[PDB]
């Protein structure tokens, strides 16, 4: 019904309020370890297009600053076709963006996603998703989880251990209710800074559509999609509805 | 001093203004992992309300006001006092209040010192803890404050058109119920206001155009919101509550 | 040494003379007080056995005339009177048998307490605060109002019933130059120096004399206006950045003796916690009150939302999860 769609879209218009209180998971600084810097404009928009119940995700790309190879600045967030769930997200493959202009020197840094449970480590479903995406391409990729809740957003960045990559490919299964031998220790702390001194941008699917949640049959997780620079649409945008009548 | 007893007196025929300076000096905070804390000031406002008519004099305090100054918290009270004094003096004599009630005691002396030219205007504190700080959770007020590029006075009626139909006391009670709810759980309170998309806010209003019938249900949802969160902060069963002073909850 | 004879003691009463007191029983043979040092001012005060809420008395200077006390049923009060017939007076004072029925004003011999408390107090100053020109002595009680508190009142008054203290109000036009609101409220130097010292008191001795008189009225009678005045005259000096040095140096001494002499029971009603904490711990002149602060800690150690911070809209927080 066009009714229930409408109420969910309304709740999402209040997401921005959560950016008043921002928490970032941090520990004693380590010099040899990389530092990831996330443009605030990117976090703000990404929250604004997300959902109150269903996980939303995207890839992150960027590069080392000129003086400091340990400081990885996030330049670009890529929203790709996906099917989100409460508790997990089915994300399509690493996108091919090298043919796009202005992407010279861009490094794939990992992925970013929302969640509605608070944790101090990558959940079982993150481990499976992160394994499937990165095990054979770039194991140093990070996972930035945003715990989104009324009143605040809490960010934590993780690296995934070799052991974690291994379990994640054993248990690639989509049910993921067994969780035999899942360990919090599969993930380790990555250093993350929020910054409003730098600006980032978005690359989106060329036809604007990234949320396949109400178009499930039409979603191909293995799909080779087309990409362009743009302003990502919100979760319940009309283009994310099945076109009717 | 105004309390929940002599509280009725608010609605007699003497012109009175409430002054809330809570949002005059406002900041955002940056706290490093070390523990070092930096503040940055954002635009603020003096909230000056006539509870009988609903007329709101919102005096926007631009950040430039703080540039080069020291003891900003102290300064903020004295600046609020100059502005309120200036406002009173701008009004025709028959529109000037007979009482000004300050929501925070620390405003008493500065304001009384600035109003010495008006010995017949009583400056009073209150033992109510009114929810006027939540005024910045009203979209249209937050917007005008944040877009300001210099100090500016903006005028609203915070009761919209309610007084065509209800008494001032009923309107003031609706208003404080709404603000208390917005103060208590902003996202949930706004959800209650946005539930029915067919009911809209007129361009000249602050609140949705509920019918008399709908307001009863909205008010009751706001009341539930408040008492529920009050029964979480302290794990008291509101079932076990008497009618008690739920009104004292609402007011402070 | 002087004598203040009493006609009789028909009502049971606790009688005070300066800082000393004694009880007299109902209709117990009594003819007054003898061996009174010739100082410059005395107070004789009363509290009946029945009354809890009520103290009263007379300030007088024995060098000025012959004074005695006689109970007056009409008013229910012990009354001071002047005997204008020296012969009749001397005849009563020097009566052998009546003198044995008098009490002797005591002494610690090297005790200068009364002087320390009254050094600046003069009868001519008292007689402008308590206005009854037909007597050379001055009646004060627990309940008497101040001239300050009745200014807005259109009602008639008996002037002898009001304490005519110098009007001091921190939130008045007199205290605050227009345009200098914050400045003059936070730093009272203009009020202290231009308005009060130069305009009204003329010198620091008149200032200190009213301050001392206000304290003693507060202590002996529990007079509320006198307490307010005493506290106000202290705050006016402490909260001024500019104070004549000779006043400043004398202040600590003055207050020390007043604090030292207070009892422990009525004092907690008497001392104002807000004013004293400001004076002793945050005012401009706080370092001029070392002795006073020290005795305040020894004698009364127990006496000594967030509007003073910005409102926090929200933030960014780096912390352990």
From Swiss-Prot, chain A:
Domain called MPN: residue spans: 35-164
Protein location: Nucleus
Top-rank lineage group of the source organism: Eukaryota
Functional note: Functions as a scaffold that mediates the ordered assembly of spliceosomal proteins and snRNAs. Required for association of BRR2 with the spliceosomal U5 snRNP, and the subsequent assembly of the U4/U6-U5 tri-snRNP complex. Functions as a scaffold that positions spliceosomal U2, U5 and U6 snRNAs at splice sites on pre-mRNA substrates, so that splicing can occur. Interacts with both the 5' and the 3' splice site, as well as the branch region. Has a role in branch site-3' splice site selection. Associates with the branch site-3' splice 3'-exon region. Also has a role in cell cycle.
Other facts: Present with 468 molecules/cell in log phase SD medium.
Subunit structure and binding partners: Component of the U4/U6-U5 tri-snRNP complex composed of the U4, U6 and U5 snRNAs and at least PRP3, PRP4, PRP6, PRP8, PRP18, PRP31, PRP38, SNU13, SNU23, SNU66, SNU114, SPP381, SMB1, SMD1, SMD2, SMD3, SMX2, SMX3, LSM2, LSM3, LSM4, LSM5, LSM6, LSM7, LSM8, BRR2 and DIB1.
UniProt comment concerning the protein's domains: The MPN (JAB/Mov34) domain has structural similarity with deubiquitinating enzymes, but lacks the residues that would bind the catalytic metal ion. Contains a region with structural similarity to reverse transcriptase, presenting the classical thumb, fingers and palm architecture, but lacks enzyme activity, since the essential metal-binding residues are not conserved.
Name by which UniProt lists this protein: Pre-mRNA-splicing factor 8
Lineage of the organism: Eukaryota, Fungi, Dikarya, Ascomycota, Saccharomycotina
Gene encoding the protein: PRP8
From Swiss-Prot, chain B:
Span list, region RNase H homology domain: 6-252
Record note on what altering residue 21 to A does: Reduced growth at 30 degrees Celsius. Strongly reduced growth at 16 degrees Celsius. Strongly reduced growth at 35 degrees Celsius
Result of changing residue 21 to N: Reduced growth at 30 degrees Celsius. Strongly reduced growth at 16 degrees Celsius
Subcellular localization: Nucleus
Positions in coiled-coil regions: none
Listed result of changing residue 22 to A: Reduced growth at 30 degrees Celsius. Strongly reduced growth at 16 degrees Celsius
Superkingdom of source: Eukaryota
Effect after changing residue 20 to A: Alters protein folding. Severely impaired growth. Strongly reduced growth at 35 degrees Celsius
Role: Functions as a scaffold that mediates the ordered assembly of spliceosomal proteins and snRNAs. Required for association of BRR2 with the spliceosomal U5 snRNP, and the subsequent assembly of the U4/U6-U5 tri-snRNP complex. Functions as a scaffold that positions spliceosomal U2, U5 and U6 snRNAs at splice sites on pre-mRNA substrates, so that splicing can occur. Interacts with both the 5' and the 3' splice site, as well as the branch region. Has a role in branch site-3' splice site selection. Associates with the branch site-3' splice 3'-exon region. Also has a role in cell cycle.
Domain remarks: The MPN (JAB/Mov34) domain has structural similarity with deubiquitinating enzymes, but lacks the residues that would bind the catalytic metal ion.
Quaternary structure, from the entry: Component of the U4/U6-U5 tri-snRNP complex composed of the U4, U6 and U5 snRNAs and at least PRP3, PRP4, PRP6, PRP8, PRP18, PRP31, PRP38, SNU13, SNU23, SNU66, SNU114, SPP381, SMB1, SMD1, SMD2, SMD3, SMX2, SMX3, LSM2, LSM3, LSM4, LSM5, LSM6, LSM7, LSM8, BRR2 and DIB1.
Note: Present with 468 molecules/cell in log phase SD medium.
Protein name per its UniProtKB record: Pre-mRNA-splicing factor 8
Organism: Saccharomyces cerevisiae (strain ATCC 204508 / S288c) (Baker's yeast)
Lineage: Eukaryota, Fungi, Dikarya, Ascomycota, Saccharomycotina
Shown segment, full-protein numbering: 1836 to 2085 of 2413
UniProtKB/Swiss-Prot annotation, chain C:
Record-linked PANTHER family: A1 CISTRON SPLICING FACTOR AAR2-RELATED, PROTEIN AAR2 HOMOLOG
Keyword Cytoplasm attached: yes
Stretches the record annotates as Disordered: 305-321
Gene responsible for this protein: AAR2
Phosphothreonine modifications at: 261, 311
Name of the featured protein: A1 cistron-splicing factor AAR2
Cellular compartments annotated: Cytoplasm; Nucleus
Highest taxon of source: Eukaryota
Pfam families to which the protein is assigned, alphabetical: AAR2, AAR2_1st
Organism: Saccharomyces cerevisiae (strain ATCC 204508 / S288c) (Baker's yeast)
Effect of mutating residue 240 to D/E: Disrupts interaction with PRP8
Post-translational note: Phosphorylated on serine and tyrosine residues.
């Amino acid at each position: 019904s066009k009714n229930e769609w409408r109420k969910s879209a309304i709740a999402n218009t209040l997401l921005y309020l959560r950016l008043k209180n921002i928490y970032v998971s941090a520990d004693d600084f380590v010099e040899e370890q990389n530092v990831y810097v996330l443009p605030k404009n990117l976090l703000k928009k990404f929250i604004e297009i997300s959902d109150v119940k269903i996980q939303v995700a995207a890839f992150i790309y960027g590069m080392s600053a000129k003086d400091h190879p340990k400081v990885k600045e996030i330049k670009t967030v890529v929203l790709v076709p996906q099917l989100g769930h409460v508790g997990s997200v089915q994300i399509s493959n690493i996108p091919d963006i090298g043919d796009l202009p202005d992407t010279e020197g861009l490094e794939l840094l990992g992925w970013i996603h929302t969640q509605t449970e608070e944790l101090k480590f990558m959940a079982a479903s993150e481990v499976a998703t992160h394994s499937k995406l990165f095990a054979d391409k770039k194991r140093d990729c990070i996972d930035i989880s945003i715990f989104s809740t009324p009143g605040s957003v809490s960010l934590s960045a993780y690296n995934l251990t070799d052991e974690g990559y291994q379990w994640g490919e054993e248990n690639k299964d989509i049910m993921n209710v067994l969780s035999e031998g899942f360990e919090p220790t599969f993930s380790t702390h990555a250093q993350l800074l929020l910054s409003d001194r730098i600006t980032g941008n978005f690359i989106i699917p060329s036809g604007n559509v990234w949320n396949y949640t109400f178009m499930g049959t039409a979603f191909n997780q293995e799909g080779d999609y087309n990409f362009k620079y743009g302003i990502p649409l919100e979760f319940y945008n009309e283009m994310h509805r099945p076109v009717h009548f | 001093a105004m309390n929940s007893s002599n509280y009725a007196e608010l609605f007699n025929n003497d012109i009175k203004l409430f002054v809330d300076d809570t949002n005059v000096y406002r900041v955002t905070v940056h706290k490093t992992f070390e523990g070092n804390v930096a503040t940055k000031a954002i635009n603020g406002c003096i909230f000056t309300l006539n509870p009988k008519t609903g007329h709101l004099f919102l005096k926007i305090i631009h950040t430039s006001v703080w540039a080069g100054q020291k003891r900003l918290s102290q300064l903020a009270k004295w600046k609020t006092a100059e502005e309120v004094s200036a406002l009173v003096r701008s009004l025709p004599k028959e529109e000037q209040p007979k009482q000004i009630i300050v929501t925070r005691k620390a405003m008493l002396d500065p304001l009384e010192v600035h109003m010495l030219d008006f010995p017949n205007i009583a400056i009073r504190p209150t033992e109510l803890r009114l929810p006027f700080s939540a005024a910045m959770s009203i979209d249209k007020l937050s917007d005008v404050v944040m877009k300001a590029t210099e100090p500016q006075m903006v005028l609203f009626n915070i009761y919209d058109d309610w007084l065509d139909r209800i008494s001032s006391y009923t309107a003031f009670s609706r208003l404080t119920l709404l603000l208390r709810a917005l103060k208590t759980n902003e996202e949930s309170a706004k959800m209650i206001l946005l539930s029915d998309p067919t009911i809209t806010i007129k361009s000249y209003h602050l609140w949705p155009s509920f019918t008399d019938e709908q307001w009863i249900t909205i008010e009751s949802q706001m009341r539930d919101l408040i008492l529920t969160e009050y029964g979480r902060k302290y794990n008291v069963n509101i079932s076990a509550l008497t009618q008690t002073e739920i009104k004292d909850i609402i007011l402070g | 040494m002087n004598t203040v004879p009493f006609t009789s003691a028909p009502i049971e009463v606790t009688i005070g003379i300066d800082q000393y007191s004694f009880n007299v029983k109902e209709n117990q043979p009594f003819h007054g007080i003898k061996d009174i040092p010739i100082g410059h001012v005395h107070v004789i005060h009363f509290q009946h056995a029945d009354n809890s809420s009520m103290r009263y008395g007379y300030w007088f200077d024995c060098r000025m005339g012959n004074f005695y006390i006689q109970y007056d049923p009409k008013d229910g009060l012990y009354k001071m009177m002047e005997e204008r017939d020296g012969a009749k007076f001397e005849n009563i004072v020097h009566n052998f048998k009546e003198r044995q029925m008098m009490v002797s004003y005591p002494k610690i011999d090297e005790d200068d307490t009364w002087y320390n408390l009254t050094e600046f107090v003069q009868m001519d100053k008292i007689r402008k605060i308590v206005r009854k020109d037909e007597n050379q002595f001055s009646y004060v009680d627990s309940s008497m109002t101040t001239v300050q508190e009745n200014e807005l009142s259109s009602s008639s008054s008996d002037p002898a019933h009001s304490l005519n203290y110098t009007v001091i109000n921190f939130k008045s036009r007199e205290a605050i130059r227009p345009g200098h609101e914050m400045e003059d409220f936070l730093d009272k130097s203009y009020y202290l120096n231009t308005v009060m010292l130069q305009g009204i008191f003329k010198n620091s001795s008149n200032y200190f004399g009213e301050l001392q008189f206000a304290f003693l009225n507060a202590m002996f009678f529990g007079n509320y206006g006198s307490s307010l005045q005493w506290h106000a005259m202290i705050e006016l000096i402490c909260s001024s950045a500019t104070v004549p040095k000779h006043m400043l140096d004398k202040l600590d001494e003055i207050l020390y003796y007043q604090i030292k002499t207070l009892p422990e029971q009525y004092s907690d009603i008497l001392l104002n916690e807000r004013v004293w904490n400001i004076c002793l711990y945050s005012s401009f002149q706080k370092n001029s009150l070392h002795n006073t602060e020290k005795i305040m800690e020894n004698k009364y150690p127990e006496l000594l939302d967030d509007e003073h911070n910005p409102t926090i809209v929200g933030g960014l927080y780096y912390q352990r999860p």
